[PDB]
């Protein structure tokens, strides 16, 4: 019965491809051809935060657009003040092999994970004054690549063992697990309403999950290599995925196919981080080519470059109010542009 | 500045703490241990004293060796191998008794890697007496079809050493080979002298005189 099942799968894939092709009547570039370009975007370094001594691997913005947490291989996770460049907290990690960090929306907790296969939650607003490890989620057999706080109680984590699992910080048990990826899942992003999320695996595919039901919904495969970053549009109906093929693409949830590709002839390094602007008109992507390029989300052309980093940029993030952008790199320097 | 001066004082204090921690932690000697499965890695990591990554730190002649046994990560190497750069040396362990084509392929993959173009490899060959007994029982031509010569233990060992050492191409790194039977306490001095030589080479390169 294996042959019949294989034939059924092949015909289902053919039907899916035909349906995706049929919905395409005009590309995004064909409709946004009569709008004025945004012009040259000149961004200057306003602040520089020099606290880390190792390669910075992840960073996150605060919900008030003022606080920022940064994690590096030195085994520390510092909390930054963007307006005054002061340091509020310095949390020492148990394992120095850290590859992700998250900041709670309410500002009470900070997550951390890496090669130790355990997600560690820290408590900031403690009555004794110091920061204490509130929980240690240990259920994964592979390195944890991403973790995002859904709320103060439950957190979703993406792991390198081809699995994604929703946790419960109250009791530390896997409430729900998401399976289906063939390779390592190295990216994750939550919806504005925290009702659904997508994962970007190393098998050049992206899947659409929902936290409540716990089943995959749609699969977007257009890339040719490992997907390193992902992020939704502010409206919540589209997302952009950057891969190692030196190109980042725009996918539409409702159209269920591609919209445009953001590639240049003089670009060879793979994408490391992708982020959107507050209005969604500017798509800033980090490159392994030592520079950050600002892409026009509707015109598919370069509006400027963010140069000034001595190494590969590992992470980038736009504030909640859209005021500034922060970029972290492997030379242990974090820069705020405006 | 009314009461933000206390915040500035706190920030300066924790910045000083970070600097002190970095200076204190910069003195550790890092080593990466690789090799095929069931090749005696556990024997050597338990021979010099003391689930994802297993770190075994010990002190020998004022050198704090931080040895990372990362064999527990059954995933794609390319997605996490880049964080192990800046390591002093790579220890490579291979079982001479058995599991040899895989070892050669792994050595070729790890010696020509982009991030490890300057890190020298300290290669170990344990189970010498098991290999000698097997030679006395079976010829060494079974593993290598293209091996021609006398079937002595020394000849076979030298041939395997040459085949392993010929895989490198970068002028800036050298392969250190040693013979062991795992029934010995000499697996710590070899690492020590190789690490000292690598330190001298790195210092000479950094000063620009090399």
């Amino acid at each position, epitope marked *: 019965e294996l042959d019949q099942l294989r034939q059924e799968a092949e015909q289902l894939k053919n039907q899916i491809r035909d349906a995706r092709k049929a919905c395409a009547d005009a590309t995004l570039s064909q409709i946004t051809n009569n709008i004025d370009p945004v012009g040259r975007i000149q961004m200057r370094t306003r602040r520089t935060l020099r606290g880390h001594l190792a390669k910075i691997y992840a960073m996150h913005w605060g919900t008030d657009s003022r606080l920022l947490v940064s994690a590096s291989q030195d085994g520390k996770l510092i909390i930054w003040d963007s307006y005054t460049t002061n340091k509020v907290h310095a949390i020492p990690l148990r394992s120095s092999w850290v590859m992700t960090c998250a900041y709670a929306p309410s500002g009470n907790y900070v997550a951390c994970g890496g090669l130790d296969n355990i997600c560690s939650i820290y408590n900031l607003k403690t009555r*004794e*004054g*110091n920061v204490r490890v509130s929980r240690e989620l240990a259920g994964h057999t592979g390195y944890l690549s991403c973790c995002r706080f859904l709320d103060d109680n439950q957190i979703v984590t993406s792991s390198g063992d081809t699995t994604c699992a929703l946790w419960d910080i109250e009791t530390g048990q896997q409430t729900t697990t998401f399976t289906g990826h063939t390779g390592d899942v190295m990216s994750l992003s939550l919806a504005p309403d925290t009702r659904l999320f997508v994962s970007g695996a190393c098998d050049a595919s992206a899947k659409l999950w929902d936290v409540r039901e716990g089943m995959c919904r749609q699969t977007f495969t257009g890339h040719e290599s490992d997907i390193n970053a992902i992020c939704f549009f502010p409206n919540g109906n589209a997302f952009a995925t950057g891969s190692d093929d030196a190109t980042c693409r725009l996918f539409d949830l409702r159209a269920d196919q591609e919209l445009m590709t953001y590639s240049h002839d003089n670009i060879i390094c793979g994408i490391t981080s992708v982020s959107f602007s507050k209005s969604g008109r500017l798509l800033l992507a980090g490159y392994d080519d030592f520079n950050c390029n600002v892409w026009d989300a509707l015109k598919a052309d370069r509006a400027g470059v963010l140069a000034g980093h001595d190494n590969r940029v590992s992470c980038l993030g736009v504030t909640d109010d859209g005021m500034a952008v922060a970029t972290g790199s492997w030379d242990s320097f974090l820069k705020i542009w405006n | 500045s*009314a009461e933000e*001066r*206390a*915040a500035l*004082e*706190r920030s300066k204090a924790i910045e000083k703490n970070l600097k002190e921690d970095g200076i204190s932690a910069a003195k550790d000697v890092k080593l990466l241990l690789l090799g095929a499965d069931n090749s005696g890695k556990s024997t050597i990591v338990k021979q010099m004293k003391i689930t994802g990554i297993v770190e075994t730190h010990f002190t020998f002649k004022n050198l704090h060796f931080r040895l990372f046994d990362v064999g527990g990560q059954r995933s794609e190497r390319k997605k996490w191998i880049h964080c192990f750069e800046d390591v002093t040396a790579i220890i490579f362990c291979v079982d001479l008794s058995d599991r040899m084509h895989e070892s050669l392929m792994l050595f070729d993959s790890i010696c020509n890697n982009k991030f490890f173009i300057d890190t020298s490899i300290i290669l170990f060959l344990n189970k010498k007496d098991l290999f000698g007994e097997k030679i006395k029982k079976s010829p060494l031509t079974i593993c290598f079809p293209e091996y021609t010569g006398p079937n002595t233990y020394e000849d076979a060992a030298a041939y395997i050493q040459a085949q392993f050492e010929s895989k490198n191409r970068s002028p800036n790194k050298e392969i250190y080979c040693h013979m062991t039977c795992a029934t010995d306490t000499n697996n710590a001095q070899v690492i020590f002298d190789a690490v000292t030589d690598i330190i001298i080479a790195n210092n000479l390169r950094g000063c620009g005189l090399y």
Partner: single-chain antibody
Amino acid sequence: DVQLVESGGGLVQPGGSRKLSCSASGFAFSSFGMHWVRQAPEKGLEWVAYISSGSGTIYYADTVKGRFTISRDDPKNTLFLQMTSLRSEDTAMYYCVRSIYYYGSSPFDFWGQGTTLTVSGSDIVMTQATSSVPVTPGESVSISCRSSKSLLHSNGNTYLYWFLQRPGQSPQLLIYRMSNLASGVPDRFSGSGSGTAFTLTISRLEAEDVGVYYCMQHLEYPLTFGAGTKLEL
């Protein structure tokens, strides 16, 4: 839990000396700045001294500099106040306060118990107009406290503090920075103001809310307390 027990108070002859200890336990004493607050038998509170985290900065009041000195012992988790040349006006019951400072912190959150000590120009003048108000349960009471200077700094934060001292107990922080409610305080307490004139609103006053209410500013040292409006049943 958090405990600040202090002792070393008693009858002292005039012109003598006395050494006071503030034992602390249950919290990280090393990163907390400690104050010293006294209270006259029939008057309000009066700031005395201050030591910072790491023994960086030390300040004294106008009537305190030179005679007194404040020191801490971080490994022993104790705060010390060597006070010398006791005059007749130094009688009070001295408190111990922890005031950790950072962005979003809550200074003056926890107060000590107190030791009785029976002894034989440009500063901000902060005054409360009314010193006594009669209240009844179920009603709303509002207390006002005017400041001589403008307390609103250029960064947008006004430094006004509100405290409540129940009969026979120690003062408890209620409002910090004139708009933020301290942790543990019931939500019925609210505060407001604009630059110079400040007011605090109490809704659905209960029998446990009886006491004397003080207003305090933290703009610059020295710190001046208010006259103290007393609300009685």
